[PDB]
Amino acid sequence: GKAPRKQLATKAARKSAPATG
Amino acid sequence: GKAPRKQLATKAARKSAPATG
Amino acid sequence: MFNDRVIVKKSPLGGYGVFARKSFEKGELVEECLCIVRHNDDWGTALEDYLFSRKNMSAMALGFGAIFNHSKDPNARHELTAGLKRMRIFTIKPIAIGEEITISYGDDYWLSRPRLTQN
Amino acid sequence: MFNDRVIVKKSPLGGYGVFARKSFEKGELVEECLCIVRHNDDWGTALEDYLFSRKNMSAMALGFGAIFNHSKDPNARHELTAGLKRMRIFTIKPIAIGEEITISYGDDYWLSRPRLTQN
Numbered sequence: 001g002k003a004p005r006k007q008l009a010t011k012a013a014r015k016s017a018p019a020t021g
Numbered sequence: 022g023k024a025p026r027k028q029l030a031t032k033a034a035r036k037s038a039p040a041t042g
Numbered sequence: 043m044f045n046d047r048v049i050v051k052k053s054p055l056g057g058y059g060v061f062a063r064k065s066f067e068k069g070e071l072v073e074e075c076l077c078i079v080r081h082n083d084d085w086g087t088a089l090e091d092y093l094f095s096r097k098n099m100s101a102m103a104l105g106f107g108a109i110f111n112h113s114k115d116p117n118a119r120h121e122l123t124a125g126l127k128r129m130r131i132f133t134i135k136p137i138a139i140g141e142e143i144t145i146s147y148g149d150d151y152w153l154s155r156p157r158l159t160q161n
Numbered sequence: 162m163f164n165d166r167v168i169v170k171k172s173p174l175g176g177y178g179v180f181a182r183k184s185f186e187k188g189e190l191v192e193e194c195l196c197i198v199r200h201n202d203d204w205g206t207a208l209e210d211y212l213f214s215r216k217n218m219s220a221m222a223l224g225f226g227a228i229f230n231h232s233k234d235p236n237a238r239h240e241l242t243a244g245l246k247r248m249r250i251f252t253i254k255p256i257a258i259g260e261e262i263t264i265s266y267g268d269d270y271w272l273s274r275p276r277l278t279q280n
C-alpha cells in the first residue's frame with residue numbers, strides 16, 4: 001500500500017519454537 | 022524382463038484399508 | 043507414549059511396533075487418533091512412508107497408525123470413520139499381556155514370504 | 162483420545178484444543194509424541210496448516226502439537242529434543258481441573274489483538 005512490499009522471504013517460517021528465535 | 026511392464030498406474034495406492042478393496 | 047493399556051517399542055527384540063501389555067479381548071478399542079486426507083501427487087511423494095491411503099486418495103497416519111509393522115499374525119487392527127479422518131485401533135482376536143500390536147497393509151505394501159494361504 | 166490426565170475437545174465452548182482435567186503443577190510433562198522434520202518447498206505447501214517449523218526447516222506435528230490453539234494465557238507449552246524429532250508437552254504454570262491446554266506460536270503465526278504487552 002504505497003510502500004515497498006516484499007512477498008517472497010528467505011526467513012519464511014510457520015510455527016515458532018519453544019525457545020529458539 | 023522380456024515382457025510388457027507398466028511403471029505408471031492410475032490405481033497406485035499405498036497402505037490398504039480395514040475393509041475397502 | 044507408554045500407557046497402562048499398551049506401550050511403544052523399541053522392544054528387546056522388535057523394531058518400532060506397539061506392545062500390548064494387555065489383556066485385550068476380541069473387539070477392544072486399544073487406541074484412536076486423528077489423521078489427514080490429501081490427494082496423491084507431491085503429498086504421496088513427500089509423505090511416501092507412513093500414508094494410510096484408501097480407494098480414492100492418500101491420507102497420513104496422525105496417531106500411531108504408521109508404527110504398526112507387518113506381522114504374520116497381527117492380533118490387532120484399526121477402523122476408519124466416514125473417510126480417512128478418525129482412525130481407531132481395535133483388537134482383532136484377544137491379546138495376551140506381552141504381545142505386539144500391528145496391522146497388515148493390503149494389495150499394495152508387500153510383506154515378504156507368500157506364506158499366508160492354505161491352498 | 163481422552164486420558165485420565167487430559168482430554169480432547171471438542172468442548173462445550175471451545176474449538177479443537179485440549180482440556181486439562183488436572184491438576185498439573187509448574188513443569189509437568191502432560192504428554193509427548195513424535196514429529197517429522199522436512200524442508201520447506203512442497204512440504205510447507207501440502208502441509209501448510211499444522212507444521213511446527215524451527216529456524217532451519219519445517220516439521221510436522223505428529224502428536225497433538227497442532228490441536229494446541231492460541232490463547233492469551235496458555236498455561237501449558239511443549240519442548241523439542243535435538244532437532245524437530247521428539248515433541249513434549251509441559252505445563253508452563255500449574256493448571257486447575259477444567260482448563261484448556263494450548264501453546265503460542267512466535268514471530269510468524271499472528272494471534273489477533275496486540276494486547277500482550279504492558280508498555
Ligand SMILES: Nc1ncnc2c1ncn2[C@@H]1O[C@H](CSCC[C@H](N)C(=O)O)[C@@H](O)[C@H]1O
Pocket residue numbers: 057058059091092108109110111112113153154
Ligand atoms: N514383515 C516385514 N517384513 C519386511 N519388511 C517389513 C515387515 N513389516 C514391516 N516392514 C517394512 O517396514 C515398513 C512399514 S513402516 C514400519 C512402521 C515404523 N516402525 C513407524 O513407526 O512408522 C514397510 O515399508 C515394510 O517394507
Ligand SMILES: Nc1ncnc2c1ncn2[C@@H]1O[C@H](CSCC[C@H](N)C(=O)O)[C@@H](O)[C@H]1O
Pocket residue numbers: 176177178210211227228229230231232272273
Ligand atoms: N486466538 C486466536 N484467534 C484467532 N484465530 C486463532 C486463534 N487461535 C487459533 N486460531 C487460528 O487457528 C489456527 C491454529 S490451528 C488450530 C488447531 C486445530 N484445532 C488442530 O487440531 O490442528 C491458526 O492459523 C489461527 O489462525
